[PDB]
Design an enzyme around this catalytic site. Structure first.
Site: not given
Ligand SMILES: COc1cc(-c2cncc(-c3ccc(N4CCNCC4)cc3)c2)cc(OC)c1OC
Length: 296
Positions: A12, A14-15, A20, A33, A134
């Site tokens: 659900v 990606k980075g 996740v 995660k 963040d």
């Protein structure tokens, strides 16, 4: 272990951070995660907050478990939480508009989670004060009861007042640039004051408030979803792009004229503004924001 027993069904997100996934455990959905081996310090930090501080609240993403295995060949690092099928506040606001009740319920639930993170509770249920560092719409999840919860404590810093100890960590990750406060961008932030980190959260909270309020309908009118500073910086903006806009030009997100015909959006415009003062000491606290939202 919870992890050996989990089936990964769909990615659900990606980075740079990792991935996740939606997964299944004992017949229930969970969120997994999976951290990059280079983001190992984030995994530990988040884990130790959940497993040692026992951090639990309606408006903080719920911990289930944390697992790591490591050999010379490879290292896998998993954080497992509750799954919220509606996804992030960022995803949700793109598809949906809000009314007064559902707008207030969202921003009130964020303020409660943030105030719970910022306040030190002593002793038996003990918790240090915690700053997130963040906050953004992607790190807020939407639940089926219309409330939200805050996620991702990989950059969190703690302070206990019984000790005089500030726990920053040695984490090479830093905030999302779009949401960085003036003092971070011009490097005047007082790095040895714990309150400096809370005030940076309050700045970011104000931007999120703006994001949400846009999508509340008023007298038949509503704006489309935009991220803060959409009109003055590119996607994935640089440190310098943000410094020019926020420090040098002193820009803040525009408040549409139509909001001042509505009592609620009028009250939210005033809060937003009191999160965005250039001077960090002048900004409201998480508790005060919560009280003010409660009063409506
Ligand atoms: C924001 O960071 C996180 C989020 C979640 C999480 C927990 N529950 C549901 C979702 C979720 C589900 C669907 C989407 N969609 C958006 C794109 N297309 C539809 C699906 C997004 C997020 C995400 C779990 C995390 O740690 C475990 C996590 O890191 C701590």
């Amino acid at each position: 272990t919870v992890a050996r027993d989990i089936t990964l069904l769909e990615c659900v997100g990606k980075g740079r951070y990792g991935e996740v996934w939606r997964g299944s455990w004992q017949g229930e959905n969970v969120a997994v995660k999976i951290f990059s081996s280079r983001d190992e310090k984030s995994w530990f930090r988040e884990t130790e907050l959940y497993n040692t501080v026992m951090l639990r609240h309606e408006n903080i993403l719920g911990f289930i478990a944390s697992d790591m295995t490591s050999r010379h060949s490879s290292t896998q690092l998993w954080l497992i939480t509750h799954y919220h099928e509606m996804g992030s506040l960022y995803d949700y606001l793109q598809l949906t508009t809000l009314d007064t009740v559902s707008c207030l319920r969202i921003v009130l639930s964020i303020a409660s989670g943030l105030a719970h993170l910022h306040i030190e509770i002593f002793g038996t249920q003990g918790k240090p004060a915690i700053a997130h560092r963040d906050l953004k719409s992607k790190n807020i999840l939407v639940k089926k009861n219309g409330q939200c919860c805050i996620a991702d404590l990989g950059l969190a810093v703690m302070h206990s007042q019984s000790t005089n100890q500030l726990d920053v960590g040695n984490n090479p990750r830093v905030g999302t640039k779009r949401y960085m406060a003036p003092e971070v961008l011009d490097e005047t932030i007082q790095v040895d004051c714990f309150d400096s980190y809370k005030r940076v959260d309050i700045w970011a909270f104000g931007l999120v408030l703006w994001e949400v309020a846009r999508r509340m309908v008023s007298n038949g009118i509503v704006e489309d979803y935009k991220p803060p500073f959409y009109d003055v910086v590119p996607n994935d903006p640089s440190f310098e792009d943000m410094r020019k806009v926020v420090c040098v030009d002193q820009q803040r997100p525009n408040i549409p004229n139509r909001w001042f015909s509505d009592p609620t959006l009028t009250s939210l415009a005033k809060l937003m503004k009191e999160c965005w003062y250039q001077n960090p000491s002048a900004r409201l606290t998480a508790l005060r924001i919560k009280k003010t939202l409660t009063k409506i």
